[PDB]
């Protein structure tokens with residue numbers, strides 16, 4: 028009961044330029060970047076980071092401006108590689124050990140320490156962190172228990188601490204979160220029920236209320252959200268549609284959540300909040316023919332950009348403009364789906 032994953036991870040460089048990371052046909056992580064912020068078409072082209080990947084990569088900027096990418100290696104350990112100055116000079120790959128059985132996801136703590144979450148060999152959630160802002164060493168791997176059947180998804184909550192969500196072996200959504208307590212720094216796992224058939228994705232509304240999206244057992248998009256910042260949750264509610272990938276979500280320029288997914292015609296579809304109350308738009312097609320979940324990012328000018336694999340395994344993209352969306356164009360490449368779950 029898994030849905031098609033995204034095939035890249037995107038981030039902005041410190042200067043605003045988007046950069047994407049994916050696994051090529053030779054099983055290496057490759058990357059491609061805007062040569063100046065906000066451009067429609069001026070990209071570097073694809074450059075290899077070498078070696079061998081066995082998961083979807085994940086990138087996050089450090090609090091000093093350096094991008095850092097994470098992937099599972101051929102040994103099933105977590106590996107990482109970083110810019111040595113903002114925008115350039117990759118370190119080469121170094122091991123963070125462990126055995127992971129999901130794709131890794133990255134969080135940044137309010138103090139500037141990166142932290143990675145992944146499923147372990149015992150199907151529990153594990154995590155590992157920088158011990159100082161934007162600097163090694165990293166901690167040992169530590170277990171947060173649970174039984175996971177999806178990638179974890181993480182966001183900062185209204186208390187400024189991480190909250191992590193995953194599907195469990197009852198096919199329901201569960202979460203855990205970090206507190207200020209020394210004795211119980213992380214909560215017990217708590218259920219939000221549901222039957223979900225994709226990876227879940229969490230995001231925060233502009234006012235701090237978390238919201239989670241996932242495909243349901245009827246292949247519609249479903250969602251569940253907090254009734255106030257760091258409060259309890261609604262029931263699961265349907266946004267209808269027929270989604271044939273994991274959903275992706277980002278806040279738009281209007282401060283409203285906007286969800287993207289592949290549809291049953293293999294086009295890219297999207298849907299957005301139209302009020303603060305639970306009002307949403309109609310599902311709306313952006314056309315295209317895609318062979319992955321979408322990945323959504325935002326340019327320095329505030330406009331969204333969506334990436335997805337095309338019919339020939341190249342990376343396609345479509346950009347929001349001041350009044351519309353652009354045409355679909357190709358960034359080339361030959362991407363595989365190396366997702367560690369499926």
Ligand SMILES: CO[C@@H]1O[C@@H](C)[C@@H](O)[C@@H](O)[C@@H]1O
Nearest residue numbers: 125126127147148149153168
């Ligand atoms: C360090 O421990 C190893 O890596 C963790 C991330 C888990 O997969 C655990 O089951 C495994 O033995």
Ligand SMILES: CO[C@@H]1O[C@@H](C)[C@@H](O)[C@@H](O)[C@@H]1O
Nearest residue numbers: 089095109161162163164165
């Ligand atoms: C310079 O890069 C910093 O130190 C390295 C040794 C790694 O621990 C990395 O996570 C961190 O960003």
Ligand SMILES: CO[C@@H]1O[C@@H](C)[C@@H](O)[C@@H](O)[C@@H]1O
Nearest residue numbers: 136142154156158205212213
């Ligand atoms: C030092 O790092 C902090 O404390 C550890 C014991 C973990 O609970 C981790 O989530 C947190 O980031």
Ligand SMILES: CO[C@@H]1O[C@@H](C)[C@@H](O)[C@@H](O)[C@@H]1O
Nearest residue numbers: 221222223243244245249263
């Ligand atoms: C709460 O409802 C349950 O979970 C939703 C996310 C959907 O999968 C629905 O079909 C199922 O009955």
